[PDB]
């Protein structure tokens, strides 16, 4: 998160910190969010051989009693995900066990297909990602408020599709989701509307978010069968 502030600890109890491993080499990290006691939503591009989710965290370097660290047992990457367009950058993660609902660990409501969110409104996103192009990832959960932009503001992203994607962050400001925030939720007036997908390497906003409402049928299909 660039230009954000430290979250009040545990104030976003659906947040999931994902550590993604592929044999021997270093791990990668993403955000995500708890939508059922045993399901986490994140971005498709965060997939990997094995994934550990940490729930109940604030400072990800300091174990605490609020932590519930759970292994992912199955990954459901959207079947139409494509790496040229990054369309359908969405994935569900089934956890080995159901999380315990506590003040620090809870689920986030996801939208009906009709609830289609429009340009000009301010939304919030949180994450543990980098705080600048050449800055470290953040040990503490950070949040920032960003403007939903018209699709034209995202015209330089390959085949930006307003039905599938949200365009997020006023280009006149430096405030933005960034590397390591992928998979985190975008909330608009307390309701989850987007998932951080991708943006510019140089951190110039806006960035592209998956529009969750479009995917409600697919999400329902996975949740019903699993």
């Amino acid at each position: 998160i660039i230009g954000g502030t430290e979250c009040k600890p545990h104030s976003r109890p659906y947040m999931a910190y994902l550590e993604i491993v592929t044999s021997n080499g270093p791990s990668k990290f993403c955000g995500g969010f708890l939508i059922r006691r045993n399901f986490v939503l994140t971005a498709a591009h965060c997939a990997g051989r094995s994934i550990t989710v940490t729930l109940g965290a604030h400072n990800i370097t300091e174990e605490e009693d609020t932590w519930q660290k759970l292994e992912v047992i199955k990954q459901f990457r959207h079947p139409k995900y494509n790496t040229s367009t990054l369309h359908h950058d969405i994935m569900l993660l089934k956890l080995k066990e159901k999380a315990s609902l506590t003040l620090a660990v809870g689920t986030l409501p996801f939208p009906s297909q009709f609830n289609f969110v429009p340009p000009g409104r301010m939304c919030r996103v949180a994450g543990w990602g980098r705080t600048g192009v050449l800055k470290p990832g953040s040990d503490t959960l950070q949040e920032v408020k960003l403007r939903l932009m018209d699709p034209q503001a995202c015209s330089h992203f390959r085949d930006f599709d307003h039905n599938l994607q949200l365009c997020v962050g006023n280009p006149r400001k430096t405030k933005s989701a960034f590397k390591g925030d992928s998979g985190g939720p975008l909330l608009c007036a307390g309701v989850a509307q987007g998932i951080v997908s991708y943006g510019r390497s140089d951190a110039k906003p806006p960035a592209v978010f998956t529009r969750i409402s479009h995917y409600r049928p697919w999400i329902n299909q996975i949740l019903q069968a699993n």
Binding site: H45, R200, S201
Partner: protein, 61 residues
């Protein structure tokens, strides 16, 4: 089968993508999804991200 080399320098424009120099080597991690890009790990930097298939070739080609 997963050890590749950059044929050219590349500067990334999406934050999901690796930048790299000609001759840098990669382990290809996932090439299943359709698209111009495969997920790879740089052996030089240890970073994971997408690389464009048309910038790379197997080390033994």
């Amino acid at each position: 089968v997963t050890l590749f080399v950059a044929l050219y320098d590349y500067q990334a424009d999406r934050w999901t993508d690796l930048s790299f120099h000609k001759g840098e080597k990669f382990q290809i991690l996932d090439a299943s999804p359709p698209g111009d890009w495969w997920e790879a790990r740089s052996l030089t930097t240890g970073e994971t991200g997408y690389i464009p298939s048309n910038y790379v070739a197997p080390v033994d080609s």
